[PDB]
């Protein structure tokens, strides 16, 4: 994937287009973009206005995740309050939609030096059953515990 | 954001004015007057506007200022605390040093001119070195000690500043550059290294706060180590981020060596403003760690502490000063049965030592725990090194309380009303900020 | 970035790369290679000799 | 008559001090005493470090002695003359998960083996 | 100005006098001592580190000798 | 109704310690006594709702305590059957405290301060045992620490109280920084920090070692024990509220709430913990470090019982609720005792006349204490022993541990009635109120209603052991009663005076890890930089 | 040493203070004085406990209105008398009350 | 002997000319010892007695470039674990010698 100079400038072009029309008419939620400016640039800061814009939007998806993150807690508290010594069992659902929302708004801006969020241990449960099953074909002793069906109350 | 830069520029103005007799007043009735145009500024700040939430320029880019996060929280600080330091001081000599500083400093947490950064907070230079080497009650050594280090890291990030506008064309952070030279990264990473005290470029602030007037302390410890933050938010992170992921465990070292030898070294102080300031070092490397994981928790955790910490290093400080008008002394084994000789005094002091040790129903227990959530997001090893060091606070803390508490003691030195309220704002602002109001 | 919720600083694609375009259309250069005197004395290949 | 009794004032200073004074601690009143008891000065029951040590190498074989039969020497087959408690299918297989449960031992069961290594867990977090 | 250095005896007779003076020289660590004790009860401070440290390198022994044994079946087969 | 008692304690504390002038010392003797009534009225209806009747509530202050990005976490109160418990035995034993404070400290001059410091100090108690997520329990953990630190060091002007609170705030403070560790894991891999939510079936071990260490610290387990023997140093009303329900129990209820602990580590901890509690308080001679290291022994048993079985967890909390009854009649029958004798050596105690009510609370404590058969002591230290049996490493030191705990617990009890008079002939007296009488009637009304209403739902269930096996601790305690009667030498003297010393933990402390630590302040700074830094 | 004029202003020392025991009795401390005592406690206390009765109705309100039961008591609770949110009590077997 | 200075009616004058003594900020001062001051200046100008000596080196050394040499190994290794956990490419840190440029992940990148 290489990009030329010519192609380079006409995006440029055609992002001041774009600024251009937003400024026709005013809007009090300008910060708070609904949809990205799409680009193939090799660096977003190239273009000033695509940098500002798609930073915005990442902002107030980060937001909607967060603020998803704590409803989707408040219904496995509630339903974790219900059942009683049946939790386990009725709360595996909404427990393993709950962690994936928590991964999801950690690990999409974590940042350079951040790891991945193991929300439920799936990524290390993963790891044991891979390393289980090369170790049961290749006739290798694996020193690590089997894969888990259940690690936490979800996943 | 107009408003409150006016009304910067028209404290200093008013002293040449004023009748050299109304000179306090005046000068309280204008800090009070800042205070209320950055609330302004609060309120003309729109959290739709993500990026920035007020930008002015005002014919030049060097005049371009403008509030974000970091910067609003540093300047509502700044402006809450400079009308305490404004009673502390009297002379108009010691008015116009103070109010000139302030000026200094509130300009360039606004600037988003990295020359122009420069200009505004290197002005107050000889202003410390006056301030701190006055006739009686200062030293020169400490002057010294300050001037070359704010000197030598400023003329270094000066030279990288330099570097960027000829490359790029501009320094100022609205305009996205991006660099991945290390020499200029060290240039800019080196005023941080010393004005953030980070072993082994910390042995200013000691001697410094030592020697300082207590409005002197108040606002170097408040504000003036906050520019650091203010700095790596605005001038490094944007543009030095490559340098940072490359050089983390490095950076790692450093902090973490701060804050362990920093720990150590406040177990040898006698001097109640020298355990203050060496625990102001100490904290200060957290806050630097958790900005530069360059996370979502990071920046915000360290600016939360940074809140903190300005609210709660200031009221150490000023109880020392008090103390220290009560009694002419500050060595703690002068010192002995301050709980029953001064009641009201031992009530406040223990309650900010309790807001050091980052107690839950403080500030700091929010801030370090976003911090050290920051920290174990990037590594469990790096926020387990923190937790555990952080006893050695507790012991050098729980000795001076206990030296303090109790003995033999002939003299009342409990404090007066001005005393009281000269610190009920930090009280009520610390008891609001620490049950979440952060 | 200049906000407490995502990342400072920014990415550029490994992938992506971009097509050199020279800084001016003629290149008139005024910094004189190095003297050939300059890389015998650089030269440390015999050691009694670089000394 | 707990408050009003009579103290001892400890004597002003009246020589050169120590350079590492700060390891005395002296309130005014007269018994004053060392920043951590024991560090320096008088030893309480005249017992030097040496002689704990030595009593606690003698101590130590018979307080672990319990603890290493069963914990060692012992195994799940011979530890007790019962196997663990027995439950329906389905109450077993959720108490198998828990790590530190107590029906991972049940040699009877077909997956012993999974379950004695599922109890030899991870040490830390893989990821 | 100063405080008088002479000292109030009116209490000896009840509690005792103050001639027994302490016997301690005011002094610290060996450095030997103080070399080893720091090199033991450090190493005992970062206990999680060691065992990060175990299990990593047993994680990428056990990984390489998978590969190893991948490549002797994949090289024949 | 849930929140009122947390309020009524909180209240007395601000009332008493910030307009005490107003109030005077009369002013406290009501306040916090009707305060704390009231919050145990509260706290009965609260046992009634949640206990006996099945009904858990969760109340929400307010959300959003801590915002940061994902990091969120609420001020919220869940009160579940294990809380309510707590809860009740900790206003009942702090309302009787407080009652009992009422007479004591009048000679002391800052008697609503004290108030206001034991108000507190409950109202966190119950702000741990109440929380629904980890940051509460901290908040509560930190206050609890904090109050103890301003209620041992209550007399200033002596170095030994004041360096007391000192090494409590440090041990302390070393645990809750394992025990953030352990909960910074949780929230990164459970995605929040709720019990509920919280649940983990495999955990790795560095979060179990973590939790281990943090809750060894309040709870005095071994190497963590330092401060518990000190922490005598205080007045008798704070001695009782830490030893019997505030300080040592909160440990055991961090471990009964999140199950990470593992079998291997806790059992010879506990095992270890008490034997060496009860030998250590063999050699005592002061009352109130005897009760002390029988509180580290019990706290032993406690911790070993998790080990066990399944059903540990509600052995160990049925022992913790039964131990604070009559540890803490023993604690306040004890500071009475040396009020009267203006003495704290068991050798100067003798038979002297006194009041009926007193000397039978410290009977019937004792015995709670050695184990005598049908009492609410007995079947909670029962119910650990028998099923200690399959543990056979644990239940030898457990038995052990039971010998030497009568041994001790008889002596005390021979030397406080039963033996000569002992001290000199001077006019001592101690004249108690009827609020003391009230107080005791209030512990002694515990202790009754505990053999009634029993400590756990598997008390009685049948552990199926040999009757020689079921009935062996009624006889080692009945063999260690009666040689602690007729006041045998046990061990040589070596031996006796290693147990005198604690085991020399302080000064394994003081010799090399204190030493260790101000040498590595003398390279920070001498050496360094006020040295190599430091100009001419 | 004769008393200083602003002793008339200080107050006495109390039923309670041991007559041995001195005090300063100029220092103030909001908890109180060494003893204490003060004339008009009674009226105070009063106060004192109508301020605590007041605080307790707005806790009240406050915790009834956030006071959740999500799962039904086994039997009747005495909350049933003030709240009207509680389920209504299913017994161990199954049967409604 | 002594008099009251402070005057809450504002009628404040400083008797400086008065025969007894006022009861200023200074009446509460500590009296102060000659061996604690001389104590204070010795332990403040503690250079003074700095000596290069073998001792002094190896204390240095060992403990303070021993923290750091630990510290920054550490913070290596999980650096490394890190990479290995994220699934990055061996990064390019500064003093490691590695032959790939990765250094700041692709946000837009999946790894
Ligand atoms: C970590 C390991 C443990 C560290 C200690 C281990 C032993 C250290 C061994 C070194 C040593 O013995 O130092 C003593 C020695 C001082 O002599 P002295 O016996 O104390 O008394 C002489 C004076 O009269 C003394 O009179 P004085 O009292 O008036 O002067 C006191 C002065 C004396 O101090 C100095 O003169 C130099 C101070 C900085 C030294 C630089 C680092 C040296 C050690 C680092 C490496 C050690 C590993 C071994 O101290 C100061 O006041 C200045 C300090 C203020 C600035 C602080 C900046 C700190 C930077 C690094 C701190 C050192 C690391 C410890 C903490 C690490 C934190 C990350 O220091 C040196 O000589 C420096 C040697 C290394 C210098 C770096 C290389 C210089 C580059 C020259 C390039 C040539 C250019 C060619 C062109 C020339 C034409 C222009
Ligand atoms: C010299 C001083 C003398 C005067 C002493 C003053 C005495 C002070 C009294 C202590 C006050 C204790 C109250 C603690 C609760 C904190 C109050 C609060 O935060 O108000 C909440 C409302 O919540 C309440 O009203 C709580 C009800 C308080 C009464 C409940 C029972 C009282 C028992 C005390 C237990 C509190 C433990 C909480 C631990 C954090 C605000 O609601 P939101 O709109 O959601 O605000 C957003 C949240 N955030 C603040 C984080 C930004
Ligand atoms: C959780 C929601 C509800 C919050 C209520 C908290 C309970 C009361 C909080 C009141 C404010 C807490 C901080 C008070 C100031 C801290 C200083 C202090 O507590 O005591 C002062 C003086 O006390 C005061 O004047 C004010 C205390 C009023 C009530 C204090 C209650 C206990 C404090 C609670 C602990 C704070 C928790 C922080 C960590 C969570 C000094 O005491 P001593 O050092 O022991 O010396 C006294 C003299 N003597 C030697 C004779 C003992
Ligand atoms: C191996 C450690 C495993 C267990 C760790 C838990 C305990 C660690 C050491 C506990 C020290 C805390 C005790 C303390 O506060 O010390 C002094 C407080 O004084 C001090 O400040 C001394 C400082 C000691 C604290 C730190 C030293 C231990 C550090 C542990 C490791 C050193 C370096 C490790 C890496 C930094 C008070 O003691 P006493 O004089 O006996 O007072 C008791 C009351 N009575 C008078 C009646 C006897
Ligand atoms: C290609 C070039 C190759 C390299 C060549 C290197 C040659 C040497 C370069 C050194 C440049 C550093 C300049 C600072 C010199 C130290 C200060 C002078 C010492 C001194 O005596 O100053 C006294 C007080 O200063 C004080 O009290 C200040 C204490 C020390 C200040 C700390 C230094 C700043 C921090 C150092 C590193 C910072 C980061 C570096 C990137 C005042 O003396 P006086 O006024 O009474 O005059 C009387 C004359 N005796
Ligand atoms: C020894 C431990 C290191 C101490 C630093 C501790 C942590 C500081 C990290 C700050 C973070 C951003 C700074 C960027 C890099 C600074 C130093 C990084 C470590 C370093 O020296 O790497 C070198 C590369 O950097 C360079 O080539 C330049 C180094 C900095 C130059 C020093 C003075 C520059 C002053 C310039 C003023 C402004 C000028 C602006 C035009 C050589 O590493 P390598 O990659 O070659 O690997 C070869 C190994 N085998
Ligand atoms: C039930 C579970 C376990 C409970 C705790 C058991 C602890 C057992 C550890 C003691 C048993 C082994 C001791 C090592 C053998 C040494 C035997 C001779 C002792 C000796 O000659 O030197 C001593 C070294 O201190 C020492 O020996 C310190 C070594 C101790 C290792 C650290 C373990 C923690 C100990 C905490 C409690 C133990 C207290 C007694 C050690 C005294 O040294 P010195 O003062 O005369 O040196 C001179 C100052 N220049
Ligand atoms: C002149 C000044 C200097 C002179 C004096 C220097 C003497 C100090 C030398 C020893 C320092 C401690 C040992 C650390 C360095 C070990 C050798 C470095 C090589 C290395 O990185 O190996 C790793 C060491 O383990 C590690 O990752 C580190 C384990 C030790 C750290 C924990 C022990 C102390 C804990 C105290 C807290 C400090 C850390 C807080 C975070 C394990 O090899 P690898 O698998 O990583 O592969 C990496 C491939 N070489």
């Known amino acids: 994937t290489t990009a030329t100079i010519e192609e380079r400038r006409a995006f440029h072009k055609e992002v001041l287009d774009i600024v251009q029309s937003k400024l026709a008419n005013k809007n009090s939620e300008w910060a708070r973009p609904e949809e990205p400016i799409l680009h193939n640039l090799k660096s977003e800061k190239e273009e000033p206005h695509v940098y500002y814009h798609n930073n915005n939007f990442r902002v107030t998806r980060q937001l909607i995740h967060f603020e998803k993150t704590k409803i989707f807690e408040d219904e496995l508290d509630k339903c974790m309050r219900t059942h009683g010594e049946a939790k386990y069992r009725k709360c595996q659902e909404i427990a393993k939609r709950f962690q994936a929302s928590c991964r999801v708004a950690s690990n999409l801006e974590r940042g350079p030096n951040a790891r991945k969020r193991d929300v439920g241990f799936i990524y290390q449960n993963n790891k044991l059953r891979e390393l289980e099953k090369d170790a049961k074909e290749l006739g290798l002793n694996n020193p690590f515990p089997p894969s888990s069906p259940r690690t936490t109350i979800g996943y | 954001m107009s408003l409150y830069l006016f009304m910067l520029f028209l404290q200093p103005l008013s002293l040449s004015f004023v009748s050299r007799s109304f000179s306090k007043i005046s000068s309280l009735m204008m800090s009070f007057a800042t205070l209320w145009s950055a609330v302004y500024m609060w309120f003309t700040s729109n959290g739709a506007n993500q990026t920035f939430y007020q930008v002015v320029s005002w014919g030049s880019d060097w005049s371009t200022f403008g509030v974000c996060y970091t910067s609003l929280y540093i300047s509502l600080l700044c402006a809450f605390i400079f009308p305490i330091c404004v009673i502390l001081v009297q002379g108009y000599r010691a008015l116009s040093i103070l109010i000139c500083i302030q000026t200094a400093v509130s300009l360039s947490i606004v600037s988003l001119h990295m020359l122009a950064f420069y200009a505004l907070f290197e002005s107050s230079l000889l202003l410390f070195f006056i301030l701190i080497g006055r006739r009686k009650y200062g030293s020169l050594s400490a002057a010294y000690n300050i001037s070359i280090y704010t000197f030598i890291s400023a003329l270094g990030f000066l030279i990288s500043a330099f570097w960027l506008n000829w490359s790029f064309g501009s320094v100022c952070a609205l305009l996205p550059n991006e660099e991945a030279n290390s020499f200029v990264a060290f240039g800019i990473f080196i005023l941080l290294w010393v004005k953030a005290p980070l072993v082994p470029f910390h042995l200013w602030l000691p001697e410094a706060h030592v020697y300082a007037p207590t409005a002197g302390s108040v606002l170097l410890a408040g504000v003036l180590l906050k520019i650091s933050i203010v700095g790596l938010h605005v001038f490094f992170l944007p543009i030095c981020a490559s340098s940072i992921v490359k050089a983390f465990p490095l950076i790692l070292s450093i902090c973490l060596g701060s804050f362990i030898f920093s720990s150590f070294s406040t177990l040898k102080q006698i001097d109640l403003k020298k355990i203050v300031a060496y625990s102001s070092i100490s904290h200060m490397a957290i806050v630097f760690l958790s900005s530069a994981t360059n996370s979502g928790l990071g920046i915000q955790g360290a600016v939360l502490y940074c809140i903190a910490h300005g609210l709660i290093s200031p009221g150490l400080f000023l109880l020392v000063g008090i103390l220290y008008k009560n009694t002419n002394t500050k060595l703690v084994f002068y010192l002995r049965g301050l709980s029953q000789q001064a009641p009201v005094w031992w009530s406040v002091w223990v309650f900010f030592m309790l807001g050091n040790l980052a107690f839950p129903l403080f500030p700091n227990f929010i801030a370090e725990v976003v911090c050290l959530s920051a920290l174990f997001k990037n590594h469990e090893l790096y926020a387990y090194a923190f937790i555990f060091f952080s006893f050695v606070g507790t012991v050098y803390s729980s000795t001076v309380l206990g030296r303090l508490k109790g003995g033999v003691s002939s003299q009342c030195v409990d404090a007066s009303r001005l005393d009281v309220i000269s610190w009920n704002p930090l009280v009520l602002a610390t008891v609001v900020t620490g049950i979440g109001y952060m | ?51 | 008559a707990g408050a009003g009794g009579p103290v001892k004032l400890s004597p002003p200073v009246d020589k050169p001090l120590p350079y590492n004074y700060d390891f005395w601690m002296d309130n005014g009143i007269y018994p004053g005493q060392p920043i951590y008891d024991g560090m320096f000065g008088s030893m309480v029951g005249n017992m030097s470090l040496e002689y704990m040590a030595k009593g606690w190498l003698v101590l130590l074989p018979i307080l672990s002695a319990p603890f290493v039969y069963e914990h060692c020497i012992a195994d799940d087959v011979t530890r007790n003359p019962f196997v663990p408690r027995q439950y329906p299918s389905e109450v077993r297989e959720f108490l198998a998960l828990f790590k530190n449960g107590f029906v991972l031992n049940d040699y009877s069961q077909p997956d012993y083996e999974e379950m004695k290594r599922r109890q030899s867990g991870l040490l830390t977090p893989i990821y | ?77 | 109704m849930f929140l009122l008692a947390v309020y009524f304690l909180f209240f007395s504390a601000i009332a008493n310690g910030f307009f005490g002038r107003y109030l005077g010392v009369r002013g406290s003797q009501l306040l916090g006594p009707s305060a704390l009534f009231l919050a145990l009225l509260c706290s009965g209806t609260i046992f009634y709702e949640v206990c006996i009747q099945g009904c858990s509530t969760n109340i929400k202050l307010f959300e959003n305590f801590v915002y940061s990005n994902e990091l969120n976490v609420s001020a919220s109160f869940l009160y579940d059957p294990l809380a309510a418990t707590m809860t009740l035995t900790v206003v009942w034993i702090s309302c009787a405290v407080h009652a009992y404070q009422n007479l004591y400290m009048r000679g002391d001059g800052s008697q609503t301060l004290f108030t206001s410091y034991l108000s507190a100090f409950t109202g966190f108690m119950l702000i741990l045992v109440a929380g629904q997520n980890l940051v509460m329990l901290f908040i509560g953990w930190e206050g609890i620490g904090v109050c103890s630190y301003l209620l041992i060091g209550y007399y200033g002007s002596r170095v030994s109280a004041v360096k007391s609170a000192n090494k409590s705030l440090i041990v302390n403070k070393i645990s809750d920084g394992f025990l953030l560790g352990s909960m910074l894991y949780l929230w990164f891999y459970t995605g929040s920090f709720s019990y509920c939510s919280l649940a983990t079936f495999q955990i790795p071990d560095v979060v179990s070692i973590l939790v281990l260490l943090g809750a060894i610290g309040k709870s005095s387990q071994l190497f963590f024990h330092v401060w518990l023997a000190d922490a005598m140093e205080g007045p008798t009303p704070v001695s009782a509220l830490i030893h019997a329900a505030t300080l040592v129990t909160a440990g055991i209820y961090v471990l009964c709430k999140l199950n990470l602990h593992s079998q291997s580590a806790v059992g010879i901890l506990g095992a270890a913990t008490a034997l060496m509690g009860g030998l250590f308080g063999l050699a005592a001679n002061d009352l109130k470090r005897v009760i002390a290291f029988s509180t580290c022994s019990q706290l032993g048993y406690m911790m070993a019982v998790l080990s066990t079985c399944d059903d540990g967890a509600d052995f160990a909390m049925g022992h913790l609720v039964s131990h604070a009854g009559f540890k803490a009649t023993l604690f306040l029958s004890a500071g009475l005792s040396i009020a009267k004798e203006n003495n704290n050596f068991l050798n100067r105690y003798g038979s002297r006349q006194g009041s009926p009510t007193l000397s039978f609370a410290t009977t019937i404590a004792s015995l709670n204490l050695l184990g005598f058969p049908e009492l609410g002591g007995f079947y909670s230290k029962e119910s650990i022993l028998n099923n200690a049996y399959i543990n056979q490493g644990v239940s030898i030191i457990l038995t052990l541990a039971t010998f030497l705990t009568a041994f001790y617990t008889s002596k005390v009890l021979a030397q406080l009635y039963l033996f000569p008079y002992g001290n000199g002939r001077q006019q001592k007296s101690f004249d108690i109120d009827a609020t003391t009488l009230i107080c005791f009637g209030l512990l002694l009304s515990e202790m009754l209603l505990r053999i009634f209403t029993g400590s756990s739902l598997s008390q009685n269930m049948t552990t199926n052991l040999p009757a020689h096996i079921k009935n062996l601790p009624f006889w080692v305690a009945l063999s260690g009663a009666l040689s602690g009667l007729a006041t045998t030498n046990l061990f040589s003297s070596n031996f006796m005076r290693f147990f005198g010393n604690r085991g020399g933990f302080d000064v394994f402390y003081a010799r090399k890890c204190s030493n260790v630590f101000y040498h590595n302040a003398y390279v920070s700074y001498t050496l360094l930089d006020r040295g190599f830094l430091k100009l001419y | ?97 | ?111």
């Open chain 3, 1 to 51: 970035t200049f906000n407490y919720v995502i990342p400072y600083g920014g990415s550029s694609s490994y992938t992506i790369n971009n097509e050199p375009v020279k800084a001016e259309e003629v290149t008139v250069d005024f910094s004189k290679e190095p003297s050939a005197s300059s890389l015998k004395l650089a030269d440390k290949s015999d050691w009694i000799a670089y000394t």
């Open chain 5, 1 to 77: 100005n100063y405080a008088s250095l002479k000292a109030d005896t009116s209490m000896d007779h009840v509690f005792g006098d103050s001639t027994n003076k302490l016997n301690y020289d005011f002094q610290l660590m060996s450095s030997k001592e103080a070399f080893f004790w720091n090199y033991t009860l450090y190493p005992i401070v970062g206990f999680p580190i060691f065992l990060y440290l175990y299990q990593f390198n047993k994680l990428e022994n056990f990984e390489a000798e998978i590969a190893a044994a991948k490549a002797a079946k994949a090289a024949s087969e």
């Open chain 8, 1 to 111: 002997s002594s008099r009251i200075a402070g005057d809450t009616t504002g009628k404040y004058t400083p008797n400086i000319f008065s025969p007894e003594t006022p009861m200023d900020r200074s009446f509460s001062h500590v009296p102060k010892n000659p061996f604690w001051e001389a104590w204070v200046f010795r332990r403040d100008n503690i250079q003074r007695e700095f000596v290069w000596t073998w001792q002094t080196i190896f204390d240095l050394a060992t403990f303070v470039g021993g923290l750091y040499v630990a510290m920054y190994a550490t913070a290596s290794f999980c650096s490394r674990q890190n990479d290995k956990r994220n699934g990055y490419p061996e990064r390019n840190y500064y003093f490691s010698d590695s032959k790939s440029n990765f250094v700041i992940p692709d946000e837009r990148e999946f790894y």
């Open chain 7, 1 to 97: 040493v004769p008393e200083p004029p602003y002793a008339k202003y200080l107050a006495n020392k109390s039923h309670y203070c041991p007559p041995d025991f001195h005090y300063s009795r100029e220092i103030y401390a909001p908890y109180g004085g060494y003893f204490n005592d003060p004339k008009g406690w009674r009226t105070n206390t009063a106060i004192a406990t109508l301020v605590m009765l007041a605080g307790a109705y707005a806790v009240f309100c406050f915790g009834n209105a956030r006071e959740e039961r999500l799962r039904a008591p086994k039997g009747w609770i005495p909350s049933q008398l003030w709240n009207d949110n509680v389920p209504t009590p299913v017994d161990y077997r199954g049967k409604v009350l």
